[PDB]
Design a protein around this nucleic acid. Structure first.
Ligand SMILES: Nc1ncnc2c1ncn2[C@@H]1O[C@H](COP(=O)(O)OP(=O)(O)OP(O)(O)=S)[C@@H](O)[C@H]1O
Ligand SMILES: Nc1ncnc2c1ncn2[C@@H]1O[C@H](COP(=O)(O)OP(=O)(O)OP(O)(O)=S)[C@@H](O)[C@H]1O
Ligand SMILES: [Mg+2]
Ligand SMILES: [Mg+2]
Ligand SMILES: [Zn+2]
Ligand SMILES: [Zn+2]
Lengths: 598, 598
DNA sequence: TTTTTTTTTTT
């Protein structure tokens, strides 16, 4: 069972070819992976245990049925095919092997006891983690008479005491020395099934995963992962004293591999080292697409290809996916400086607001979707819970902190009583949060960006009242936003006809990987710095805004807006990779700021 | 004695005939034993009415003991299986046997089962609560002596058990007088298991008494049948718990049947007959059902035409990742005493999954979902509301104008996106609530009056008024002769307790509840050639309600009514494409809903 | 059988 499998696995690792494409035939697929493992660190080999289903079917039966008696063989059989690069680079730890599956295999509700101790894949949304927990591997005993120190190994899963000193023979004198032994790490994590893939009218479950030595801190609460690992069940004892164990066991999952890369969402900020892993064939494409005179309107108009025209809102929601520069103000003692853009959408019903939130939330990774009445003051930022076991108050993170890199869509913005609405004042302007409760006195921080949607008061935009009266929001909250989009319902018959003609079409029946990579690039290698010709159009663009917004009674302008223009201007320059802010990048993001409130 | 019973059961298992198989006299258990011998089946629901057909004595002594007999049967089948086709005779069982209640017994209530029926076959009815999740329960623990290379087993009965440290094989002990043996979760055998509580129907309780509970240990194959908050009927032994003389008791389920419909679950027998396809194929099948909905109520020929579309429901799309709901919501604004709380009470009983709620007796967190703490553990858990428990069905809210205004905006979420997004201080999730709502309300101050226009003797904010595809508006103006027919109807009802016999007869409730479930799964399409007709209709609407002095707030959410109110009709006529004759029916409905004002 | 924090029904 042991020798018969490494011989059958090495073959796979050597002679395998796929009808696929990687990193944007180079036959030695896993040998190329094994070469990359040698040119850099990171001694892990991510093998797909479905490729081993094409090449073979009698190991793919024994990998998902006896995974703990196979994966050591899959390590050994990789160490030897590392012969090519043995003399070149000599790392130390060992080489590893990690089977996985591109697609899930089960739910959290259909785990049956014919699946105990066999490879299994699920998916969920990590809720909370814990601090490290040691776990002994090699004991270290020592006698009180002979003072002789033997070092017994844990082989089966328990530690046995020798009871005979190899020198003095006192038949029990070998104490266990703790801090001279060897330990390894162990973390406890909790999943939670996704809203999709659950039965009719039911509440989410949780499942406990146990990480191990190297996967110990590779995931954060608020992430959506595809965990792959063995499924085990261990007994429990009714007393912590007697050996009367129960008969209903208790199950967890010894994780073996994570996967956070989903196809449909953009690139999360773990792949900044992976941006240097772009095909140089692709950087040409991006730099050349960034030269056409309207690449702005050509990318924007490719957001949500189901909304009707609404041309400006897609412009704003596209500039929000880039954000101003990340300047470093630690020297001036000013503090930090927000670089993300907050957008508010107000307008009478039926105008397709909630569809834009539902579309963005499904686009960006690391996001959330909240509502009006089903969210409280502390549930959005940070609460304090009586931890069940240790009976102590511990801090947790809300929704505005779990996003932290992404967008926090807050629908039904009007229908939140003024208490829970005055909480956003801190987290959305300073990018911080200062907590001072019973035993916890700390200061979090996040890099979120709200995208809110509200209805006018009376839910009907009556043009008798003033713009600062249909919204009915204060000024200390309207100024923290910088793009207040007033959608309206004009009764032009031509518009209604075109819209209906468009909507009916949804009943019969640019690319993404251009946008999905253009964005990663424009994040990685761009930093627009202002100029002196641009800076001289930014001063007057604020001295006129005051005289304009003063009289009309629409929405006043405070110096904070003058920073928003910066935030917008720079964010425009990033679209075209211009690396330097010029004049037009202020006129555009000034016309945008003016022609949204009309 | 029992040695002669193990033969009187083998006789019955090998000899029993049955005619209703639709063929000749075959063997009900003759085929079953073969299937079980080929490991294509796990459970064998030995009915007891069939033993009570040729031996009404054995039934008397089964329901008297039912604990020995459920073992004699599992020995009889254990012997018969090889004759058709390890050491302990239980590790190689791989099937289980369950008694299906005898018809002569009567279903007790939870309060009735007393101590005089401990250890007998009983039958209870109740509401499920706190169903656990499946966990592996051990049956035959398999140990191994690694030293002497052997295998040993032990069978478990209690909810606890003490392991072994012997290796009682006299050879291993005799040779060396030393050796320990490890437990092992491979050679052992688990079985699914979950516990769930039952409560009395709060209806069948003394006027002000507290309901009593019982515990049910579902295991084997009956798992995952029952959902929490559910009407169920259970059949199983009633035993005491192991480990002074007082004893706590649980019900050990042998058979679980859902009785939601007030009779049974007949999803297996739910197929229609050609003699019913006769009716369903008639010209006006759509018009028979409409008249056979709450026949006790005179008039309202059109309202019953829409309350059927609500039960059938349109189709739901998903283009370019932009969900569109496929349910219909309906309100019944109207004067007092027009039988609205009768129509709703009827549509409650004609739905597989339904819920009934009153506006003045239900809070906004009790509709959607509530987070509540456990003073035993201090842990906050989620608890579904009304709209969650009515996931794939219908919810009914009468007295809808009297619901508190902060407890009513908690429905705007469930009516469009059909999720519930909770971000309180224990939980952060989105439950699925795909319910279609039906509500009733009184217009202004009890009675419509012709002085004030609409929208002021209705008092709904446009944002909520537009969520309803059909806000039906009923009036009652006195009529010297219509009152006469209404009275001659109601007095007939109070004489005979039935409705007067019209030309034809209403279908039974049991039969319509099947006619509809067959009529849901069609999914018709839309033809392109119609997009010009539909369009014009919609345009015309935006004219009238823009050039009138009474009309409501119409928006681009009205077009999707016309669209989704026609895929319902085309779904009744069993077509697989929407035809120009149904668009006009839909358009007539959306017009016959406000004519009661002219 | 005590504090402190957080949610929901009630006067
Ligand atoms: N311009 C548009 N493009 C595409 N779909 C639209 C457009 N306008 C309206 N719709 C459709 O009309 C409906 C509008 O619903 P929503 O997007 O939820 O509106 P809303 O802004 O959420 O309404 P309220 O204010 O919250 S009740 C959806 O079915 C949209 O598909
Ligand atoms: N057309 C009708 N056909 C049959 N019964 C009717 C009719 N009109 C009234 N009734 C009876 O009159 C009573 C009306 O009571 P409800 O159905 O509660 O009225 P309602 O529509 O709920 O009025 P509100 O909204 O609660 S004041 C019931 O006993 C009905 O059976
Ligand atoms: Mg909305
Ligand atoms: Mg009523
Ligand atoms: Zn010693
Ligand atoms: Zn032994």
């Amino acid at each position: 069972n042991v020798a018969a499998c490494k011989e059958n696995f090495q073959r796979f690792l050597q002679r395998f070819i796929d009808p696929l494409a990687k990193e944007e035939i180079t036959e030695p697929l896993y040998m190329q992976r094994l070469g990359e493992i040698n040119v850099i660190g990171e001694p892990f080999l991510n093998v797909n245990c479905e490729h081993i289903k094409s090449f073979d079917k009698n190991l793919y039966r024994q990998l998902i049925s006896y995974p703990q008696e196979v994966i050591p063989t899959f390590d050994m059989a990789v160490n030897e095919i590392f012969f090519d690069r043995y003399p070149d680079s000599i790392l130390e730890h060992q080489i590893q092997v990690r089977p996985f599956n591109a697609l899930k295999t089960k739910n959290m509700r259909n785990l049956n006891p014919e699946d105990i101790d066999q490879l299994i894949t699920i998916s969920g949304m990590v809720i909370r983690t814990s601090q490290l927990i040691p776990e002994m591997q090699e004991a270290f005993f020592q006698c009180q008479v002979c003072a002789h120190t033997t070092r017994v190994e844990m082989d089966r899963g328990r530690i046995a005491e020798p009871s005979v000193c190899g020198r003095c023979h006192t038949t029990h004198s070998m104490a266990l020395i703790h801090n001279r032994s060897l330990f390894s790490d162990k973390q406890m994590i909790k999943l939670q099934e996704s809203p999709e893939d659950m039965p009719a009218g039911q509440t989410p479950h949780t499942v406990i995963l146990f990480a191990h030595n190297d996967l110990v801190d590779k995931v954060q609460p608020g992430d959506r992962v595809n965990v792959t690992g063995i499924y085990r069940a261990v007994p429990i004892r009714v007393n912590p004293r007697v050996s009367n164990v129960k008969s209903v066991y208790k199950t967890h999952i010894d994780v073996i591999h994570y996967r956070k890369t989903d196809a449909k969402r953009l690139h999360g900020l773990d792949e900044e080292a992976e941006q240097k892993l772009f095909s140089e064939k692709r950087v040409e494409l991006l730099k050349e697409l960034s030269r056409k005179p309207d690449i702005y309107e050509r990318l924007a108009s490719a957001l949500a290809p189901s909304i009707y025209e609404h041309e400006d809102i897609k412009k704003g929601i596209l500039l929000q996916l880039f954000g101003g520069t990340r300047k470093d103000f630690s020297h001036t003692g000013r503090g930090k400086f927000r670089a993300e853009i907050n957008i508010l959408l107000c307008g009478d019903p039926g105008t397709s607001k909630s569809q834009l939130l539902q579309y963005v939330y499904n686009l960006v990774p690391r996001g959330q979707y909240t509502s009006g009445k089903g969210s409280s003051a502390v549930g959005l930022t940070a609460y304090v819970m009586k931890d069940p076991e240790t009976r102590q108050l511990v801090l947790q993170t809300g929704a505005l902190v779990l996003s932290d890199n992404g967008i926090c869509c807050i629908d039904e913005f009007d229908k939140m009583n003024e208490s829970t609405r005055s909480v956003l004042h801190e987290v959305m302007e300073q990018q911080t949060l200062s907590i001072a409760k019973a035993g916890i006195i700390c200061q979090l921080n996040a890099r979120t960006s709200v995208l809110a949607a509200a209805n006018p008061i009376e839910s009907q935009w009556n043009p008798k009242k003033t713009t600062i009266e249909n919204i009915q929001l204060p000024h200390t909250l309207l100024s923290r936003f910088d793009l207040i989009f007033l959608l309206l319902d004009p009764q032009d018959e031509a518009y209604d006809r075109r819209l209906a003609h468009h909507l009916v079409a949804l009943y019969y029946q640019l690319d993404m990987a251009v946008l999905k990579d253009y964005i990663a690039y424009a994040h990685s290698t761009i930093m627009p710095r202002l100029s002196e010709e641009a800076s001289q159009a930014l001063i007057e663009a604020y001295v006129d805004m005051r005289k304009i917004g003063s009289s009309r009674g629409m929405v006043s302008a405070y110096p904070r807006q003058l920073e928003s223009l910066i935030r917008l201007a720079e964010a425009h320059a990033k679209v075209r990779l211009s690396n330097k802010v010029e004049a037009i990048d202020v006129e555009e993001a000034k016309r945008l700021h003016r022609e949204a409130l009309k | 004695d029992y040695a002669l019973e193990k033969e009187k059961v083998k006789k019955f298992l090998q000899e029993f005939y049955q005619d209703d198989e639709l063929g000749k006299k075959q063997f009900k258990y003759g085929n079953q034993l073969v299937r079980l011998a080929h490991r294509e089946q796990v459970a064998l629901y030995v009915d007891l009415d069939d033993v009570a057909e040729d031996d009404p004595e054995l039934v008397d002594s089964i329901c008297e003991n039912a604990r020995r007999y459920a073992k004699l049967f599992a020995d009889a089948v254990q012997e018969l299986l090889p004759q058709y086709k390890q050491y302990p005779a239980e590790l190689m069982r791989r099937f289980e046997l369950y008694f299906q209640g005898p018809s002569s017994n009567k279903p007790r209530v939870i309060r009735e089962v007393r101590a005089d029926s401990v250890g007998k076959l009983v039958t209870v009815r109740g509401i499920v609560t706190r169903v656990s999740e499946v966990k592996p329960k051990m049956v035959v623990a398999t140990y191994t002596c690694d030293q002497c290379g052997a295998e040993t087993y032990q069978p478990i009965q209690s909810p606890t058990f003490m392991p072994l440290i012997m290796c009682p094989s006299q050879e291993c002990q005799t040779n060396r007088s030393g050796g320990r043996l490890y437990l092992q979760t491979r050679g052992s055998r688990f079985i699914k298991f979950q516990e769930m509580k039952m409560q009395e129907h709060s209806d069948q309780v003394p006027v002000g008494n507290i309901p009593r509970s019982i515990t049910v240990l579902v295991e084997g194959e009956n798992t995952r049948i029952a959902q929490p908050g559910d009407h169920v009927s259970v059949t199983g032994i009633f035993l005491p718990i192991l480990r002074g003389l007082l004893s706590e008791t649980y019900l050990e389920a042998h058979r679980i049947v859902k009785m939601n419909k007030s009779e049974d679950d007949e999803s297996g027998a739910g197929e229609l007959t050609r003699e019913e396809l006769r009716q369903i194929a008639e010209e006006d099948f759509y018009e028979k059902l409409a008249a056979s909905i709450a026949p006790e109520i005179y008039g309202h020929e059109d309202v019953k035409k829409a309350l059927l579309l609500l039960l059938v429901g349109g189709v739901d799309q998903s283009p370019r990742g932009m969900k569109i709901r496929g349910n219909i919501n309906i309100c019944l604004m109207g004067d007092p005493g027009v039988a609205k709380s009768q129509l709703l009470s009827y549509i409650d009983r004609l739905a597989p999954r339904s819920q009934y709620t009153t506006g003045r007796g239900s809070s906004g967190v009790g509709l959607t979902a509530a987070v509540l703490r456990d003073s035993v553990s201090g842990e906050l858990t989620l608890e579904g509301g009304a709209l969650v428990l009515a996931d794939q069905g219908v919810c009914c809210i009468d007295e809808f104008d009297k619901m508190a205004e902060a407890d009513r905006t908690a429905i705007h979420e469930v009516m469009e996106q059909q999720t519930i997004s909770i971000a309180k201080a224990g939980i952060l999730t989105t439950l699925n609530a795909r319910c279609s709502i039906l509500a009733a309300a009184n217009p202004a101050y009890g009675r419509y009056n012709p002085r004030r226009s609409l929208e002021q003797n209705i008092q709904l904010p446009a944002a909520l008024l537009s969520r309803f595809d059909l806000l039906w508006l009923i009036q009652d103006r006195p009529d010297r002769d219509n009152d006469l027919r209404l009275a001659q109807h109601i007095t007939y009802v109070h004489q005979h307790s039935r409705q007067p016999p019209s030309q034809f007869e209403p279908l039974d409730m049991k039969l319509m509840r099947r006619y509809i479930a067959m009529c849901r799964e069609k999914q018709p399409m839309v033809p392109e050639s119609l997009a010009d007709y539909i369009t014009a209709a919609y345009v015309e609407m935006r004219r009238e309600a823009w050039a009138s002095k009474d009309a409501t707030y119409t928006s681009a959410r009205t077009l999707l009514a016309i669209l989704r109110l026609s895929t319902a009709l085309a779904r009744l006529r069993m077509v697989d494409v929407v035809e120009k004759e149904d668009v006009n029916e839909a358009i007539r409905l959306m017009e016959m809903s406000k004519d009661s004002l002219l």
